[PDB]
Ligand binder design. Sequence first.
Ligand SMILES: Nc1ncnc2c1ncn2[C@@H]1O[C@H](COP(=O)(O)OP(=O)(O)OP(=O)(O)O)[C@@H](O)[C@H]1O
Ligand SMILES: Nc1ncnc2c1ncn2[C@@H]1O[C@H](COP(=O)(O)OP(=O)(O)O)[C@@H](O)[C@H]1O
Ligand SMILES: [Mg+2]
Ligand SMILES: [Mg+2]
Lengths: 92, 48, 96, 48
Amino acid sequence: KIYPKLHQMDMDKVSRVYADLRRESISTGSFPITVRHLESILRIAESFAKMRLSEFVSSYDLDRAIKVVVDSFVDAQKVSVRRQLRRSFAIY
Amino acid sequence: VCLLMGGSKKILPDGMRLRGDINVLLLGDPGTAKSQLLKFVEKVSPIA
Amino acid sequence: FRKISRDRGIIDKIISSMAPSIYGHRDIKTAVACSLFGGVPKNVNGKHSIRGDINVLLLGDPGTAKSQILKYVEKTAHRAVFATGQGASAVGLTAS
Amino acid sequence: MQNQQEENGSEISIEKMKRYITYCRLKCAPRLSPQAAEKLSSNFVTIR
Ligand SMILES: Nc1ncnc2c1ncn2[C@@H]1O[C@H](COP(=O)(O)OP(=O)(O)OP(=O)(O)O)[C@@H](O)[C@H]1O
Ligand SMILES: Nc1ncnc2c1ncn2[C@@H]1O[C@H](COP(=O)(O)OP(=O)(O)O)[C@@H](O)[C@H]1O
Ligand SMILES: [Mg+2]
Ligand SMILES: [Mg+2]
């Protein structure tokens, strides 16, 4: 019965987060970042929201989701690239 | 758009058969959305 | 249900109620919870589909209890099926 | 923004389009104009 919603007041943050993770990925010379990563971000945010039987995807859920994708990408990389990125992405 | 309409089929009196159909290749990086284009062309064509 | 849903931090309770007999590995348990709840499938005017389920791959060294988590998921879920790549199982992956 | 401009003649639908393509396919066969053939012929040589 729980089909959570995506009211777009919360679009400004993710645009600029994706922009930064794209600009950083090419500079460091590693896996490319495509929009499938952002689709995963939103689809995981849906699950974190549905956990609270919620009615409007929160920003807390988006922030919890962001860690999963960023950590996966950072931890699936070579040692040198990984040391670069684990410092660059410290804020998320 | 041009693909789904195909060229004009021509049968000649030499037994020879000049085809009419269109072939396109989508070569490129990952995550360019070229797969969704195929999945839509599946559904917008009468036989696919 | 609704009462437990109002307690702030239901997320970390769920994440620690998962495989309740394997030590540590919080990230995999978080991913298990995410893929065991799901999401929303989408059709944009019957011409564009974005899936809802989230896939999870495990890559690990011998002796890290991956099969134990796979066993737990099958006792916890409604519609779950088990198949093996190189072994003897009651169901295959190909239609016939 | 699709279900709205759809009803303003700035978009065909998915079954309507399908029917239209079937129609034009199983209706006509274009044969080119001779006033244009030499254009395509000169183009090919300048290309090669
Ligand atoms: N982190 C862990 N916590 C608890 N038990 C563990 C842990 N890692 C391994 N074990 C235990 O060690 C054994 C490992 O067997 P298991 O088949 O689950 O490992 P596996 O990684 O799936 O196997 P393999 O990769 O070699 O095929 C089991 O008894 C499992 O419960
Ligand atoms: N330009 C775009 N506009 C809309 N959606 C896009 C765009 N680029 C990517 N996507 C989305 O991101 C994903 C891209 O992956 P996919 O279509 O499988 O591409 P590829 O063919 O490169 O593997 C899809 O889910 C698609 O809907
Ligand atoms: Mg593809
Ligand atoms: Mg095993």
